Amino acid sequence: PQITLWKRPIVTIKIGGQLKEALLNTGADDTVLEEVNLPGRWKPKLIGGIGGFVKVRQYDQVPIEICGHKVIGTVLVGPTPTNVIGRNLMTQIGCTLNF
Amino acid sequence: PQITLWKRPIVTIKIGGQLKEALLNTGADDTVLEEVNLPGRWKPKLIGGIGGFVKVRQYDQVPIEICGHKVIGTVLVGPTPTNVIGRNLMTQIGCTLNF
């Protein structure tokens, strides 16, 4: 699909057997979700945005289906005003900017 | 051009006669820069991101050339960790996400 930018580029994902929506975010290196629950071990991490830093759990090799495309990568779980898919997953689906 | 997401989608801009780099950010509604000197009147605004919220100046109708494409629109000036081109300007240059 081609997605224009007149509205926020939001897509439906499935992760951990649950359905969420999330913003395709070229401004984000990493993928950050809240209130998903992933199984197993994680590592504590801190991520930074516009107004400061937050603590997140880092999970590796998490299966995520992103607008009907199956991918595996790192998923960070923590406080965020909104769910974000970052470049680490976007490259996996072959997502580009075009102008 | 087409820009893949294996690294940060950073472009060169000219704004108010100064040259800057900025990150093409589908996750930002608005365009936020630091250390730019815009002329004239402006209104205080607060923007939010991950980590919390930042006080900014809002300037309307600011010419800005973004990868050699001339557009006009709202530019926010305030403490950001990186300069961001938002969707408000990206739609003006015809920028889309493709996968």
Binding site: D30, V32, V84 | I50, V84
Partner: peptide, 6 residues
């Protein structure tokens, strides 16, 4: 409004 690194 304006979305991350480190």
């Amino acid at each position: 409004r304006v979305x991350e690194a480190l």
